[PDB]
A paper describes a structure:
Kinesins are microtubule (MT)-based ATP-driven motors that have many important roles in eukaryotes. Kinesin-5 motors are important for mitosis in many organisms and, for example, functional disruption of kinesin-5s in fungi and vertebrates prevents formation of the bipolar spindle. As is seen for kinesin-5 in other fungi, Ustilago maydis kinesin-5 localizes to mitotic spindles and contributes to spindle elongation at the start of anaphase. To begin to understand whether Ustilago maydis kinesin-5 is a possible target for novel and specific fungicides, we determined the structures of two different motor domain constructs of this fungal kinesin – with and without its fungal-specific N-terminal extension - bound to MTs using cryo-electron microscopy (cryo-EM).
We therefore undertook the structural characterization of two U. maydis kinesin-5 motor domain constructs with and without this N-terminal extension: N+UmKin5 and UmKin5. As is typical for kinesin motor domains, the UmKin5 density is split into three layers: a central β-sheet with sets of α-helices on either side. UmKin5 binding to the αβ-tubulin is centred on helix-α4. Additional contacts with the MT surface are formed by helix-α5, β5/loop8 on β-tubulin, and loop2 on α-tubulin. Strong density is visible at the nucleotide binding site consistent with the presence of AMPPNP. Based on the well-defined position of helix-α6 relative to helix-α4, and in the context of extensive prior knowledge about the consequences of this configuration for the conformation of the motor N- and C-termini, density visible along the edge of the motor domain central β-sheet is consistent with docking of the motor’s C-terminal neck linker, directed towards the MT plus-end. Loop2 is longer in UmKin5 than human kinesin-5 and Cut7, and density corresponding to this loop emerges from a small β-sheet lobe at the motor domain minus end, forming an apparently somewhat flexible contact with the surface of α-tubulin. However, loop8 is positioned, and is long enough, to form a flexible additional tether from the motor domain to β-tubulin in an adjacent protofilament. Loop5 emerges from above the nucleotide binding site and, in the case of UmKin5, protrudes away from the motor domain, similar to the conformation in Cut7 loop5.
Residue numbers in the entry:
A (entry chain B): 2 to 44, 47 to 360, 369 to 437
B (entry chain A): 2 to 38, 49 to 439
C (entry chain K): 1 to 382
Amino acid sequence: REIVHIQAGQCGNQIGAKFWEVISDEHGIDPTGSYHGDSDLQLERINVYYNEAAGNKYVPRAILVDLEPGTMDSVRSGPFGQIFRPDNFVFGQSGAGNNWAKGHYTEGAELVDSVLDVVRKESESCDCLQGFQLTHSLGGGTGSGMGTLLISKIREEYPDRIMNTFSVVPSPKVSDTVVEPYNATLSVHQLVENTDETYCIDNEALYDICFRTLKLTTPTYGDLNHLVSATMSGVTTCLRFPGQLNADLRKLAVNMVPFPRLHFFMPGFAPLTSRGSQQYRALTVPELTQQMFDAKNMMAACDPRHGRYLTVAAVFRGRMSMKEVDEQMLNVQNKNSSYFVEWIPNNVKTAVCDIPPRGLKMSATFIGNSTAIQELFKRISEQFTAMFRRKAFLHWYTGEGMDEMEFTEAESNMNDLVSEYQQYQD
Amino acid sequence: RECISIHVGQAGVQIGNACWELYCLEHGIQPDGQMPSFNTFFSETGAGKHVPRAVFVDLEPTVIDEVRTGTYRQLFHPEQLITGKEDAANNYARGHYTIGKEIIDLVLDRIRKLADQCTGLQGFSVFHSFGGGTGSGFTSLLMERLSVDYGKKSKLEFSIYPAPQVSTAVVEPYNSILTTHTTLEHSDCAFMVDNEAIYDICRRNLDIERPTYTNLNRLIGQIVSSITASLRFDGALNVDLTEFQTNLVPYPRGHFPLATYAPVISAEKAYHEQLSVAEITNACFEPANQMVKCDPRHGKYMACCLLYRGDVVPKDVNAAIATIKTKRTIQFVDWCPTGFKVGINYEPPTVVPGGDLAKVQRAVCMLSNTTAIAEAWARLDHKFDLMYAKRAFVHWYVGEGMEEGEFSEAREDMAALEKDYEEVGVDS
Amino acid sequence: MGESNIQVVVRVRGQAPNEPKRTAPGILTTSGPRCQQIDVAIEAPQVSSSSAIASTSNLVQESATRQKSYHFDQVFGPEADQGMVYQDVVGPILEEVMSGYNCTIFAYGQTGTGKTHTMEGDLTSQMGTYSSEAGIIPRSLYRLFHTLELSKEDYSVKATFIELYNEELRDLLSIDSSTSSAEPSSSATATKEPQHALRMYDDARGKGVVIQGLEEVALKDAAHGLSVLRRGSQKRQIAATNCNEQSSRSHSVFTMTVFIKDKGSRGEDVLKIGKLNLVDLAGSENIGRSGAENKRAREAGMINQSLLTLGRVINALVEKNSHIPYRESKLTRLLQESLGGRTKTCIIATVSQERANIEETLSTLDYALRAKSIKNRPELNT
Ligand SMILES: CC(=O)O[C@H]1C(=O)[C@@]2(C)[C@H]([C@H](OC(=O)c3ccccc3)[C@]3(O)C[C@H](OC(=O)[C@H](O)[C@@H](NC(=O)c4ccccc4)c4ccccc4)C(C)=C1C3(C)C)[C@]1(OC(C)=O)CO[C@@H]1C[C@@H]2O
Ligand SMILES: Nc1nc2c(ncn2[C@@H]2O[C@H](COP(=O)(O)OP(=O)(O)OP(=O)(O)O)[C@@H](O)[C@H]2O)c(=O)[nH]1
Ligand SMILES: Nc1ncnc2c1ncn2[C@@H]1O[C@H](COP(=O)(O)OP(=O)(O)NP(=O)(O)O)[C@@H](O)[C@H]1O
Ligand SMILES: Nc1nc2c(ncn2[C@@H]2O[C@H](COP(=O)(O)OP(=O)(O)O)[C@@H](O)[C@H]2O)c(=O)[nH]1
Ligand SMILES: [Mg+2]
Ligand SMILES: [Mg+2]
């Protein structure tokens, strides 16, 4: 009944910093950590993310990890920093060089046990372990290196649990670094074999979302991640809140995974309307399901209509009606009956909460899985094919000591992965 | 001389949330137990504030917290509100094996304190689903473990069953095949309701296009009070559960009836209509009022049980009886000579406060039998066979110790079941 | 491209000194439903044929005929000796892999069916066992010091014992003082050394071959200190269920390597190296029957999860479709060298004989039925 949180990297520490901003306002909470919400369903299942203590206090069940000091200090210097309790900033005074072959390798290893103790500070004291939520990068080192060594030890300590993470797919459009096709590249050698699931969020589509379809000018990191933040919260509303057809994360793990390696997924937020389009739009049940077809609301940089969908889950918010919910779902199965696979007749899994977030009246959460999401992978894998031939800027890492055999097999780890969607695509 | 309820699964709970509202509507029972003048589902307290003879099972703490904090928390007893820790997460494997052996010693324990209070127990009924893990694997445990200690009572199943067109999860046919063969191995009598044709009642007999799960189930809830709750009450031709034993089921293993309900009229249509006994019998055989996506015209009628409510005199019935025999478009069987066993009771069905259906003078529940469900059985089997050809969605149950050979065990015997509906019109 | 496809062999349970005193007095004898035959290796189990209103499974028969007569290459019964199985299975190919051919042995079936009696076995009634009769491992280790010595050639006894306990690979030939009762420090120090590389090699010399970290080789002059394989099998993890108390819990992969050199008459030395992947698996536990418990549950399911993934391969081998996913179980990557690969590999199909365990063997009986359409291409080493 409880979920443990981990953050890493310059982004995934910053990304979840926007997330707990929202979950604090999910329940009407003081910036200190006092309760002032009004809904009783807010108060009822506090336990899953929080650790209520004496003095009528609330502790976000979260461990914040970095090798850079001032990043998480800026979280603490910023508001919604005192709502944490400061016995949890496990960090070190050394830069990783934004390197997977250092953060997984040396300067994390003097910080591993200091992390896992705060895990053991929490996870034994938990009533029932249910969630190991991570938020990090695949572009830098701290989001890529240290978390892979976490999962090599956390699953070693918890084989009977569930491993999800929100890892950020690199953008060939917008970036700043160079060895970016290594950090995600060597992450896959540990992300696939030891995590039950992860998603694939890329800025390369995210810029197209806020700028075009939401009528915004400047995509900031505080705003591109605020888009991610609602889609985070929509993953596990039924586990937290009452609903008619409530679904587990493990239920979401069951029906969305046909096969224990093809477990990469994609979010989607349904009332993606602009500021101006409020007074010129009627908001219905097919209005929410309309974006399931939308290429511009698929938050990863792929055409959904390019491949064919394997599995899609729909997690709804609002006092709806199932006959309208089912038959509108039925029509989307009937509208484009080539976009799915054949051997799965019910291509969709429903999920219906009873309470949407405040301000709105309807919301939803798209969770799809298609044979075109590999388009994110062919971009990265082909970039690897150029960096290896000259062995270009190899002389930051061979002094560390990662092998060409790793560069051989993790390379072929990708081709074993990607080329299975096209078995079932065409 | 009593009867016990079992509510398993997130579907199986909210079924009773209407039904026990109706059961407490049977006597004006407020959240205390205010009632004059009846011992079927109830015990009487020292203050006489009656309590249900019902069992709740929920592997999550999710649904029941609504029940035990919202309205009608106090009529139930925390003896009964048996909540659990974790779902099996829609898994027949963990619902039968892993989590299921953590609560079953507490659930069977409440039975020995309630069933022993029954002075000559009539029977008891089980509520579950097919898609839900809770309703699949726990059914595989409970319905065999009851027959270890109750091999000589009645075991009714009002089981919610999926549509061949509208479905809500992937492994829903991948559940029911593993469940139902061992269910038919042990259970006595099983009903099935499809939400497909329930939606058809929403658009054609309710004429409302925004239903709730209450409104799909107060329909199911109004059935049972006419199945059983009036059988305590004295009318003209009262039936009981034991008049279904070798009556309705002409075999050891054929026990699958089909429930319909004839007067389904929204309150606007209470006046472009003048109801009769003969009209509502004509409503009994509409293939668009089967509550399951099925046409009786493709099949036959092995048997048919007419169970009536309110002001019903059989001379008015007997005319409509031979009428349907004469106006037949049914292709009746060879093997049943004439058998139409009759149920006539006295009580009107009561109006759900804030509910849907209309204050009537007379009402019908009907059980019948057909080989048309054997199509709708196999229509789910069409969804079932192709997932095995990929061997897909397979790691959750072999990872929890259920065999591939079970799927060769269950379905081929389930096909043997479906081939044994066809033995009706063979020998003649 | 080769057509050196496969070998399919079958031995069943039977004459094991608890078993025949209750089965053959209880139910029909040595293959009751099954009809053991030896010539064309045909066999066919059935059940009772009743006019069943719910027709039972295995009602496919007629008056006086057999059904699912899965006639194989070579099937055997309780009568087949350890040497008689060695007469047909292992013996006539152990002098063939001396030239450089490679083999792999593994079993599959219902739990407790005697896989480890075939693989490991145990000795016979001797006061001093001079590599006495047991399962398939010491009999080849007895032929080890015969056909690598009576050939009178410079040999190299090379082998390494690796256990695989729930998606790991652990050496049991090690110094293993840390696994026993030793003295750790009262507090933990800093790890001044970098990371450790283990098992994580794949090459592109051929395909399917996987290179491993830290192959602790074993060299013996005779069978005198060959109880290190028993010392290794001692640390192999077992448990005590109720379906079988004797059947193991973990599963192991043991390799063999025969580097033999002789200067041929052509003027060059013959660098011939063989491989005998002596691989044993755990019992496919039906946990509702056996009664596994909390920690035993994850110990039980990953066995079947591995066997599921093992079933996830052979269907795609006979399918002939692109990108057969060998990449879930590490056992499959150890098996992708020959499962669709190049060299030789035999398949052991040990199953049950209970009437209550006829359907439970049909998933194995389907997998042995599909066990012919896997293509390879043979080669040796020079
Ligand atoms: C007039 C007014 O108040 O309007 C709404 C609003 O209309 C719109 C425009 C909002 C607004 O959001 C944005 O403008 C926005 C811009 C970039 C990226 C993300 C959001 C809103 O900020 C979003 C905000 O939504 C919420 O408060 C939800 O509960 C939301 N909460 C937060 O994100 C939040 C976080 C910190 C502080 C306050 C709110 C939520 C949604 C899902 C899951 C959890 C929480 C509200 C009321 C509105 C505005 C102010 C305009 C929209 O977003 C959300 C998340 O609801 C943009 O698409 C929807 C459409 C909404 O109708
Ligand atoms: N008619 C009707 N069917 C329902 C209702 N709620 C759930 N169902 C059906 O029940 C099936 C799932 O069973 P549930 O009871 O919800 O799940 P469960 O038995 O608790 O087991 P889990 O899946 O593990 O949660 C779905 O396919 C639904 O169609 C309902 O309110 N009315
Ligand atoms: N063909 C056979 N010949 C002789 N003994 C056999 C044969 N088949 C089975 N047995 C006996 O069957 C018994 C029970 O099998 P057992 O060896 O304990 O389990 P298992 O199948 O090997 N499982 P595992 O230990 O996990 O590999 C053993 O004591 C064997 O002696
Ligand atoms: N959405 C988002 N992505 C960011 C942000 N900062 C960095 N990234 C992305 O994250 C990747 C770099 O990883 P980062 O966390 O910054 O470095 P690390 O700390 O060494 O792991 C690149 O793909 C950046 O585009 C941010 O604030 N928001
Ligand atoms: Mg459930
Ligand atoms: Mg054995």
